[PDB]
Amino acid sequence: DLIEKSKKHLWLPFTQMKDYDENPLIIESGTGIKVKDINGKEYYDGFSSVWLNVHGHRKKELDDAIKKQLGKIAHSTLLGMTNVPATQLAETLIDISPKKLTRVFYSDSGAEAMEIALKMAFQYWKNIGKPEKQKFIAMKNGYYKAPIPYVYRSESGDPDECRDQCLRELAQLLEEHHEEIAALSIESMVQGASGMIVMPEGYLAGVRELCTTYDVLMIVDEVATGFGRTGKMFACEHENVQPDLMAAGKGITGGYLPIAVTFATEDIYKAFYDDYENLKTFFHGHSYTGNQLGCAVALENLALFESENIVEQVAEKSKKLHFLLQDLHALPHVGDIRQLGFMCGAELVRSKETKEPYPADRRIGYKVSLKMRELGMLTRPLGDVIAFLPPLASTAEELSEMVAIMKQAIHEVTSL
Amino acid sequence: DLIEKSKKHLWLPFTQMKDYDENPLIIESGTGIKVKDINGKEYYDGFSSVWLNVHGHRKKELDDAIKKQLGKIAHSTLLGMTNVPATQLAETLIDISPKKLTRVFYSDSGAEAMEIALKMAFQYWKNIGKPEKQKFIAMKNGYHSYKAPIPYVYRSESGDPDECRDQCLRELAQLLEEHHEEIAALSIESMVQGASGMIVMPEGYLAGVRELCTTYDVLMIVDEVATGFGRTGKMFACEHENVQPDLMAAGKGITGGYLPIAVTFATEDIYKAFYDDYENLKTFFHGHSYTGNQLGCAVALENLALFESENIVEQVAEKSKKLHFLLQDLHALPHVGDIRQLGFMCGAELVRSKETKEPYPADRRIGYKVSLKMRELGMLTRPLGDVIAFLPPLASTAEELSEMVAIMKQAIHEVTSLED
Ligand SMILES: Cc1ncc(COP(=O)(O)O)c(/C=N/CCCC[C@H](N)C(=O)O)c1O
Ligand SMILES: Cc1ncc(COP(=O)(O)O)c(CN)c1O
Numbered sequence: 001d002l003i004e005k006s007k008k009h010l011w012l013p014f015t016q017m018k019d020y021d022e023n024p025l026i027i028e029s030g031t032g033i034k035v036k037d038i039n040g041k042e043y044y045d046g047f048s049s050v051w052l053n054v055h056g057h058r059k060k061e062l063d064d065a066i067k068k069q070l071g072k073i074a075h076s077t078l079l080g081m082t083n084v085p086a087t088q089l090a091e092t093l094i095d096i097s098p099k100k101l102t103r104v105f106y107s108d109s110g111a112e113a114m115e116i117a118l119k120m121a122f123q124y125w126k127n128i129g130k131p132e133k134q135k136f137i138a139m140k141n142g143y144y145k146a147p148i149p150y151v152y153r154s155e156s157g158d159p160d161e162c163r164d165q166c167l168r169e170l171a172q173l174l175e176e177h178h179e180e181i182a183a184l185s186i187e188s189m190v191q192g193a194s195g196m197i198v199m200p201e202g203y204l205a206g207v208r209e210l211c212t213t214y215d216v217l218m219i220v221d222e223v224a225t226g227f228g229r230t231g232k233m234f235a236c237e238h239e240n241v242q243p244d245l246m247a248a249g250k251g252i253t254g255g256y257l258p259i260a261v262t263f264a265t266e267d268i269y270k271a272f273y274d275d276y277e278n279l280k281t282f283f284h285g286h287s288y289t290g291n292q293l294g295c296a297v298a299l300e301n302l303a304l305f306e307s308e309n310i311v312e313q314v315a316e317k318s319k320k321l322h323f324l325l326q327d328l329h330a331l332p333h334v335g336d337i338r339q340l341g342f343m344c345g346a347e348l349v350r351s352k353e354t355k356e357p358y359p360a361d362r363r364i365g366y367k368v369s370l371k372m373r374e375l376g377m378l379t380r381p382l383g384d385v386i387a388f389l390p391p392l393a394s395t396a397e398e399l400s401e402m403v404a405i406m407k408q409a410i411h412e413v414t415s416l
Numbered sequence: 417d418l419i420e421k422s423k424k425h426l427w428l429p430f431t432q433m434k435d436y437d438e439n440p441l442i443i444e445s446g447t448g449i450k451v452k453d454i455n456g457k458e459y460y461d462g463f464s465s466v467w468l469n470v471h472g473h474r475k476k477e478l479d480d481a482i483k484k485q486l487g488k489i490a491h492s493t494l495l496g497m498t499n500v501p502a503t504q505l506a507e508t509l510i511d512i513s514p515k516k517l518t519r520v521f522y523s524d525s526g527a528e529a530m531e532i533a534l535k536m537a538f539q540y541w542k543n544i545g546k547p548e549k550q551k552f553i554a555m556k557n558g559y560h561s562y563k564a565p566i567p568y569v570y571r572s573e574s575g576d577p578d579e580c581r582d583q584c585l586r587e588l589a590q591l592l593e594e595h596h597e598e599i600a601a602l603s604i605e606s607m608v609q610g611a612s613g614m615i616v617m618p619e620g621y622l623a624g625v626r627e628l629c630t631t632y633d634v635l636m637i638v639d640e641v642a643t644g645f646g647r648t649g650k651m652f653a654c655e656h657e658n659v660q661p662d663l664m665a666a667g668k669g670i671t672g673g674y675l676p677i678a679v680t681f682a683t684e685d686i687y688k689a690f691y692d693d694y695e696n697l698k699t700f701f702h703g704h705s706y707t708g709n710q711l712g713c714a715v716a717l718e719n720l721a722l723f724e725s726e727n728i729v730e731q732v733a734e735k736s737k738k739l740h741f742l743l744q745d746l747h748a749l750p751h752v753g754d755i756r757q758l759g760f761m762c763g764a765e766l767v768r769s770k771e772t773k774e775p776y777p778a779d780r781r782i783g784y785k786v787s788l789k790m791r792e793l794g795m796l797t798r799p800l801g802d803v804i805a806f807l808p809p810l811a812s813t814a815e816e817l818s819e820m821v822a823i824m825k826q827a828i829h830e831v832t833s834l835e836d
Contacts (some may be wrong), residue, residue: 006498009506011519011687013703015496016694025497029488038500050493050705057489066486066711070479072445074674077465079798080431081441082422084454090425105427108524108676109704250705256490258524258676258706262427269427276432277779285429286525287466287668288676293482361695380495 002026002038023370030057033391033398035378044402046372046379048391051192051224053255054301054310055393061304062254062297069296078106078290086290089299093261096233096302100242101263105282106289110223113247113260114185117219119284120245120268121183124217127271127280133182137173137216141194144177146170146184148191149200152336152347153355159200167206174214183217183245189235189340192224195385196345198338205239217244217268223260224343227251228305228392231315231341238340244268251392254301259294310392314341320396321403325388328407333414344388346406348414358384364414371409377402386410418442418454439788446473449809449816451796460795460820464760464809467610467642469673470719470728472811477722478672478715485714494522494708501713508720509679512651516660517681522707526641526667529678530560530603533663535702536686537601537635543689543698553591553602553634559611560603560639562595564588568615570754570765571773581618588625592632601635601663607653607758610642613803614763616756623657635662635686641678642761645669646723646810649733649759656758662686669810672719677712732759732810735817742821743806749825751832762806764824766832775802780835789827795820804828 003024012020026038033056036042045053055062069085076083090104105120107113118136125133140147147166154162174181186207191197211218220243225235228251232238236246245268249260274280305311318341328334328346335349348364350356358364365381372379380387390402419440428436442454449472450458461469471478485501492499506520521536523529534552541549555566565584572580592599604625609615629636638661643653646669654661663686667678692698723729736759746752746764753767753775766782768774776782783799790797797805808820 002500002503005507006503009510009518009520010494010498010503011521011682011690011700012494012496012498013522013707014699014701015703016690016692016699017687018691018693020496026503027489027492027497027499030492035489035492047493049491050495052705053491057492058487062490063486066490067483070474070482073443073451073473074478074482075465075468076443076446076451076473077463077468078426078428079466080428080436081443081796082426082428082436083443084418087418087422087426087442091421094425102425103427104425105429107429109528109706111704112525112528254490257711258704258709264427269433272427273432273434276435276781276784281430281432282427283430285431286527286676287468288525289429291676293675363694366694378497 019366023373025373032056033394042376043373044377044398044405045391046377046402046406047387047389049255050380051229051389052250053391054228054251055254055304056391057255059254061300062256065296065300066256066293069292073292075288075291075293077287079285083290083292085292085295085299089295089302092299092302093263096305097246097263098234098236098242100265101246102266103264103269105262105264107260107262107286108258108288109260110247110249112286113223113249113262114219114221116262116284117245117247118183118185120262120264120282121217121219123282124268124271125182132180135177135181137181137184139186141191141197142185142187143191143193144173146173148197149203150197151200163200163203163206166203167210170207171210174210174216178214178216181216183219184211185219185221188220188222188225189230189238190225190343193382195347195382196338196343196387198340202239204236204241208241219243220246222246223249228311228314229342229389231311231318233305233311235340252301253294253298254304256297257291257294259291259298314392317396317399318342321399324400324403327403331407331411331414334410342389342392345382345385346388346410348384348386348410367413368410371413372405375405375409377405377409441791448472449812458794459791460816460823461809462790462795462797462820462824463805463807465673466798467647467807468668470646470669470810471672471722472809475672477718478674481714481718482674482711485710489710491706491709491711493705495703499708499710501710501717502708505713505717508717509681512720513664513681514652514654514660516662516683517664518684519682519687521680521682521703523678523680524676524704524706525678526665527560528704529641529665529667529680530637530639532680532702533637533665534601536680536682536700537637537663539700540635540686540689541600548597549600551595551598552600555604557609557612558603558605562591564591566609567618567621569618577618581621585621585624585628589628592628592634596632596634599632599634601637602629603637603639606638606640606643607648607656608643608761611800613765613800614756614761614805616758620657622654622659626657626659637661638664641665641667646728646732647759647761647807649729649736651723651729670719671712671715672722674715675709675712677709677716728810735812735814736760738814739817742818745821746825746828749829749832752828760808760810763800763803764806764828766802766804766828776835782831782835785831786827789831790823793823793827795823795827797824
């Protein structure tokens, strides 16, 4: 009846409940990079619990640090005071992140880390003495507007040409309006929910140049892409960018608990530092900010990154997956395949010559994902882009098994 | 070392770090209703860690459930599927919630639980045919748009509650008469304005807000984040007027204070409007990644199981009788303007003179200077400007309360007296 009960009471995030009612799924537990439902059936975790599960479920040394931190204290506040593991994690996060990012402002979630970034950005200009700086630049498809080098559906198909066109179009937009912009928000290297659109080489760097040149702050959303995943600690390493502000989460705790961070340059911190009377204080916060348990599990997740060398591991297991996922090209209705590190997606198309998309009512992304659930694998389709973002743990043979279960399930339905 | 560290790397919420640098503080541990800083010192947690903590620090039962749960699975997603604790907790949450509220949408914070409610309420009307329904009504100074007045008795002409009560209810009617077809929802704290300064509403203010909201087809958003799960003397504060909100937000107390879990509650009417085939674009495109954490739901399950066992709710009701008398002492101080309380939510409002009702000026920092004095005396609290906010754990005993209130009297006395 737990199934029956999940229909009566819940209301699930980013899902249409009529499709859940027709196909229920309730997990009980999980081990390694797998999970088990309540009428015991086991799956892979192809979407690593939506882009946050680093070393699998039941990982020993994370289960360890939570238990330990229950030994001391589970939650005390960061409002006006602080606590030990937040204080320690902060130090670790300053060292493992771009050098210009000196500060750290915690919150419960990715979206909260970005809203926080926007609010610092807006409030920084207001503090220093340039209130004109209000407007923002969203990057088209960004989960004013500026376009992102989406080269597969471009005019020339050429990365460098698409890139430089997107840079130029941004540059024109900055040329004309910069003296009223405050900040620019961009996902670090890969637009996630937009279909896993990898940015071509030199894009991010161009944005950084143009932001510096034009006195707009660069905000870099590293929530999906951070903590391994891209085959670096943070995806903005791939071009040596220092964001002015950067939002992080998901894989900060190993997958276990909800913590997020907003990193901030010291120049930015300084703008909010002054006597209380002036109302310069950044007035933002949440009540479970600096959770001891979250900070403790994240500290040991951050230790594992350094000891078990999980980042460098990922960069070698990717190469394997470069060719092993180029094997998807063989299938007829799989018009493009993208990756950066473990961050992977296969865009489905009706015609390879025309790259024509399927209709969205033909439901092909979702219909595929149900057939993986048939064959013991879990993912989420972004439209008709099937996502493949598996645990960083996941060994090169599982990396290989999933990709076939994926490929098998695509072909089974994409023939229809 | 940690002190020097905290000062060089952290950016803390709702705090001038310049202040944190004259007066830093780093908790290491806690035991029942006490916390222990790094230099050994002990404090009463007289703000329940900002209105979260219910049973005490290091409570075995809650300690146990997280370990229990840990050896199943720490986190599996609610995007498109579910998990066992969330599905159980929800059943539970439905029984203790009001009747009309039969869905549970989950999230990581109170702020988020409100944010979801606004989007649900906003989008609700789009999905049914009335998209012109789109503006909200915010109750003035409402920490969670036409602003609508809310009865603050102490500084109200009347001095009489019901006159301040009914006067505000009408002003909301004059708003609702001439603007209701544009209005999606109304947003209101359940029984007490927290951040505003622990301002308690007259009985049947919230009743009257709810009967008007029905008469004009506006949705009633009830924020129970600060006032939920015991704090007022009921499991939910709106029970003080039997009230049936269309959307209710919760967080905080829900996990006894251990983890972050928060919930938006919805009526089955609302939920209905998002039920369809995907084609129709009826869906609610929202919901964070750590939605339905096993560890937070597990800790919450147990927290509520304790609520059920010990009878924490009637216990607070019991102990609040004591608390009111215990707070009577505070009114004997020259500068304590006024003492507001419902359940464990109390506020002593400070003033230059308790005859003019004239507050102190903002730069003199009378709330902050007292909060520090309390720290010095071994108590943690956070002011709401010159409103000083006592909110002790719901496990707090009769004598702990007397000691916390004593420290508070000592503190307010010593700082107000000195400003002369
Ligand atoms: C009705 C209500 N909703 C939401 C929140 C915050 O929910 P969260 O985002 O943490 O999940 C609070 C206060 N929450 C505590 C915040 C501190 C209050 C005040 N700024 C102060 O300085 O004490 C609240 O009173
Ligand atoms: C770029 C970005 N930012 C924020 C989020 C959401 O994070 P949260 O659910 O914790 O807000 C996502 C989800 N993948 C994302 O891709």
